[PDB]
Every structure is written in structure tokens, then in C-alpha cells.
Design a protein around this ligand. Structure first.
Ligand SMILES: Cc1cc2nc3c(=O)[nH]c(=O)nc-3n(C[C@H](O)[C@H](O)[C@H](O)COP(=O)(O)OP(=O)(O)OC[C@H]3O[C@@H](n4cnc5c(N)ncnc54)[C@H](O)[C@@H]3O)c2cc1C
Ligand SMILES: Cc1cc2nc3c(=O)[nH]c(=O)nc-3n(C[C@H](O)[C@H](O)[C@H](O)COP(=O)(O)OP(=O)(O)OC[C@H]3O[C@@H](n4cnc5c(N)ncnc54)[C@H](O)[C@@H]3O)c2cc1C
Lengths: 247, 247
């Protein structure tokens, strides 16, 4: 059903994304408030939706609700390593092996990979909209905006949080931009897909967008630090990026 | 000192911007809190800075501090029309006729014109940086980001506020992008100015950016309303926009 090519990089993205979703539900047992439990639970709901449930039209939505319910009720005092044990036990129990990470080392790269994963899901949903509907895609895009608006870092970086709070709109803007092309199709002018950035839409737009945003954040971090970029620092190019993902 | 061409449209922008700054200080007498008075006072400080003070290197900064102080102390019960009288009296008193609006009819267009004004100031500061310094421009850009982060609508539109909260980062992103080109110049690679959107920067980038953002918000409003765009609705094109402003 999904047309995303299988590549070593997409495999890494998917695994990082599952790790991210795991570190997120891990936060549930330690939630300081009902309001945060509600926010965390809806984020994990959407995350698992996009990675392991949507393939089967969310038929397993209740099993995820149960995984979330279990996570909220787990002990706040147990170690991340104990939670890992029980999490793996519970996901197997619930027939959600597909939602389990294989690698558990969490870095900034995990969070970036997670964002790049979503960008690919977004482009793929748009590409294959004729197999779902315009309405279904519009509804998934609303959820995507909520997801990007509410990114939890998990690791500690107050500078990262403030900065993302300031520029996350660049990402949401491009989701609205897709919604505009879909609505123009709804009203009678099919999307024409183009190579470059009355109804035109760049092919693989969202993959390009987040690649671009990822370079921008890394260029900006040298200004934050008030330093010349390291001698070996280099941006990802769109030519290489498309080849790595076979776009 | 400023290289922005004089055109009827730029005149309208400047007047709208002064009206906006006036409607902002009008809010001071009615402020519900110290925290809001502080936020409102810093916004008006920056606004007048960019429109009527920076030409003379903020030599009149204290007169504006006095205008703000007066506005905070004015009666909360007097009518906008009374405040207009006294405001005009006080600005004349303080030799700030240059900061007075001529037209007082406040619309969404006033707010857009205000944003377009700032975009032109941003491009102009970058263009003429050799006459100030890289540091001075970097410092003005920080202030620009604060200004755009904290836009008050003044008129009532809860939909507008939520939406701008979600996508304002598109604008701030482009301010950081300018900061990246300036820092790359600092470290030894002059900016090359280009026509289209190792150190390249689009000429009139920020004018293009906010023009683009203004079209996006107007396209998006039909999706919010769940309607086909009106038969006579049309986007501004960059070709016409540059001619209107003689860019
Ligand atoms: C949302 C977010 C906001 C952040 N904000 C800040 C901040 O304000 N200040 C700060 O100092 N740090 C911030 N960070 C972290 C920063 O972006 C780096 O990830 C971190 O400094 C580690 O750098 P790294 O050298 O390990 O490179 P990373 O960028 O983390 O590299 C990880 C992997 O990504 C690949 N890669 C590099 N560029 C791209 C690209 N453009 N597209 C796709 N893949 C790419 C690399 O090949 C490598 O495989 C933020 C991170 C995120 C996720
Ligand atoms: C920051 C902000 C956020 C907003 N968010 C929303 C929202 O979420 N939902 C909503 O319904 N409304 C929103 N609005 C208002 C909306 O953008 C319109 O301004 C409003 O609906 C009135 O439309 P209008 O027909 O009078 O056109 P306006 O766009 O307000 O037109 C005013 C003038 O701008 C010119 N113009 C048109 N397009 C451009 C362009 N791209 N660049 C430069 N000039 C242009 C026109 O020629 C005209 O002279 C927002 C406004 C602002 C300032």
C-alpha cells in the first residue's frame, strides 16, 4: 500500500522512530500532571498510528490504547532498562512486535530520523491519495501538524526547545501548503507534480522541506554558539539525499 | 541612508505601520497586567525604533520612552478618539511628528502593510550593511524576530491568532536564514545576491517571503472556511509586487 522505497536509511528512520515512540511512552509513568498525560498519550497514539497501525487501517488501535494504559500505570521508580524489559513483554503480548525498536541508543539523530520518517509518510500519503481519498489525507495532515507542533525532545536541550518553538512554523507552513494543493484538486484542478521547490506541488516536497530544515538548524547552531562552523561540517545535498532514499 | 525606493505603496505601508504602532500604545492605558505592559512597551519601543528613530541612530529614544510612559498613565476610560487627540498633542510636544499616522482606519490590511514595511527594512539593512556593520545588523535582526514572534492583532480574530501561532516560524526561519548568510560573510565568504529563492542570498528576500506568506494565509483561509475560493480572489505575483515597490 505504501510506495516508500526500502533502503538502509529508511530502515534506520523507522527504527529511530519506534525508539522515539518508546522513549515517549516511558515518560508516561513519570508524568507530572493529567494535562501532560493527556498530551503524551495523544502524541503516542498518533506516532504508533503512523508507523505500525495505519497499514491495517488502525484495526489495532485498541491494543495501542492498552499499551498506553499499561505505560501510565507502570511504576515511576523503575529504571528505563526495567521499563524496556516490560515494554518488550507487553508489546509481544499485544501482537505489536511491529511497533518495537531494535536499537535503543537515543540521540539527537533519533529525533531527526523520526522527523524524516514523518516527512516520507506525508509525501507518500499525498502520492497515493487516489487509493485513499482527499478527505482521508486532509485528516492525516491535521494530525501531522499536531505532532510537529508538540515535539518532545526527551533529552535535555533548552536551547533546542526555544529554537524549535521559534521556527517549527516553517514545517507546519509546508503541511498547510500541501493542504492548499489538495483543496485546489478538490475544487477541480488536479495537482501537477514538479521537480523544483495553477496547482503545482514539488515531488517529495516534505522530504526536501525537513532535509532543508535539518541543514538550517545545524547552520544556526554555530551562530548560537558564536563560532565558525567546524572545518569538517557539511550540509546534506538534495542530490545525495534522494539517492540515499531512492526517491 | 535608507535605499528603499519611494512609491505610493511604500507610503501606504509607512502610514499603516504608524497607525499600527498607535493602536498598540493605545492598549497601554487598558493593560490588564505589569507583564502585558512590559510586553506592549517593548513592542512599541522596537516599532518606533524601526520607523522613525533608527534614521537618527535612536537619538530620540528617550522621547519615545516618554510617549510610552504617558500612554501607560492615560485614563483607561477615555475613548480611542480622545486618545487620538492627546496622542497627536503629545507627539507634537515631543518633536515626533514623524511618528504620527495620517490615516486612522485600522483593518487587517494595516497589519499586513506593517509586516510588509518590516520586510523592506530588513532587506534594506542587509543591503546597506557595509555602511553600518555586520554586528549592528545581527542585533537588529534579533529585535525583528522578537517583533514577529509577538504580533498583536488588536482587532478580534481568534482564528488568526491560532493560525499565526502555528506558522509564524516560517517568517522567523527566514530571519535566521539571513543571519546565516551574514555570519558566513563574517567568516570570510561574502554574500552573493541572486534573483531566485557557497553564500547566496536572494535579493529582496524578505519582501518576497512576506509577500509569499501573505498569499499563503489568504489561500489557507478558504480551507479554514471550508469553501472554494471566491471567483475573483487572486494572489499577488512577485513580478507585479516588485514593480509596485520599484524593487
Ligand atoms: C528539532 C530539533 C531542533 C534542534 N535545535 C538545536 C538548536 O537550536 N541548537 C543546537 O545546538 N542543536 C539543536 N538541535 C540538534 C542539532 O541539530 C544536532 O542534531 C546536534 O547538534 C548533533 O549534531 P550531529 O553532528 O551529531 O549531526 P546530526 O545533524 O544530528 O546528524 C545525524 C545524521 O543526520 C544526517 N544529516 C545531516 N544533515 C542532514 C539533513 N539536512 N537531512 C537529513 N539528514 C541529515 C547525517 O548524515 C547523520 O547521519 C536540534 C535538533 C532537533 C531534532
Ligand atoms: C498575520 C495575519 C494572520 C492572519 N490569519 C488569518 C487566518 O488564519 N484566517 C483568516 O481568515 N484571516 C486571517 N488573516 C486575515 C486575512 O489574511 C485577510 O487580510 C482578511 O481576510 C481580509 O482580506 P482582504 O480581502 O481584505 O485581503 P488582504 O490580503 O487583507 O488585502 C489587503 C491588500 O493587500 C494586497 N495584497 C494581497 N495579497 C498580497 C500579498 N501576497 N503581498 C502583498 N500584498 C498583498 C491587496 O492588493 C490589498 O491591497 C490574517 C491576517 C494577518 C495579518
Amino acid at each position: 500500500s505504501s510506495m516508500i522505497p526500502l533502503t538502509p536509511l529508511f530502515s534506520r528512520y523507522k527504527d529511530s522512530y519506534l525508539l522515539y515512540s518508546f522513549r515517549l511512552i516511558d515518560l508516561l509513568r513519570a508524568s507530572k500532571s493529567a494535562h501532560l498525560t493527556k498530551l503524551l498519550s495523544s502524541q503516542a497514539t498518533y506516532l504508533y498510528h503512523f508507523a505500525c497501525l495505519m497499514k491495517y487501517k488502525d484495526i489495532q488501535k485498541y491494543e495501542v490504547q492498552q499499551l498506553i494504559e499499561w505505560a501510565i500505570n507502570a511504576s515511576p521508580d523503575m529504571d528505563l532498562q526495567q521499563f524496556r524489559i516490560e515494554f518488550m513483554d507487553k508489546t509481544t503480548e499485544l501482537n505489536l512486535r511491529s511497533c518495537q525498536p531494535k536499537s535503543f541508543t537515543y540521540t539527537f539523530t533519533t529525533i531527526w530520523d523520526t522527523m524524516h520518517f514523518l516527512s516520507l509518510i506525508i509525501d507518500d500519503m499525498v502520492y497515493t491519495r487516489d487509493k485513499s481519498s482527499l478527505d482521508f489525507v486532509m485528516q492525516q495532515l491535521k494530525t501531522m501538524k499536531v505532532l510537529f507542533y508538540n515535539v518532545f525532545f526527551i533529552l535535555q536541550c533548552a536551547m533546542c526547545r526555544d529554537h524549535y518553538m521559534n521556527v517549527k512554523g516553517f514545517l507546519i507552513y509546508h503541511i498547510e501548503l500541501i493542504e492548499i494543493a489538495l483543496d485546489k484538486e478538490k475544487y477541480g484542478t488536479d495537482i501537477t507534480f514538479v521537480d523544483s521547490y495553477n496547482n503545482m506541488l514539488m515531488k517529495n516536497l516534505m522530504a526536501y522541506v525537513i532535509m532543508t530544515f535539518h541543514n538550517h538548524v545545524n547552520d544556526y547552531k554555530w551562530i548560537q554558539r558564536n563560532q565558525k562552523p567546524p572545518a569538517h561540517y557539511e550540509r546534506m545535498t538534495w542530490g545525495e539525499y534522494k539517492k540515499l532514499l531512492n526517491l
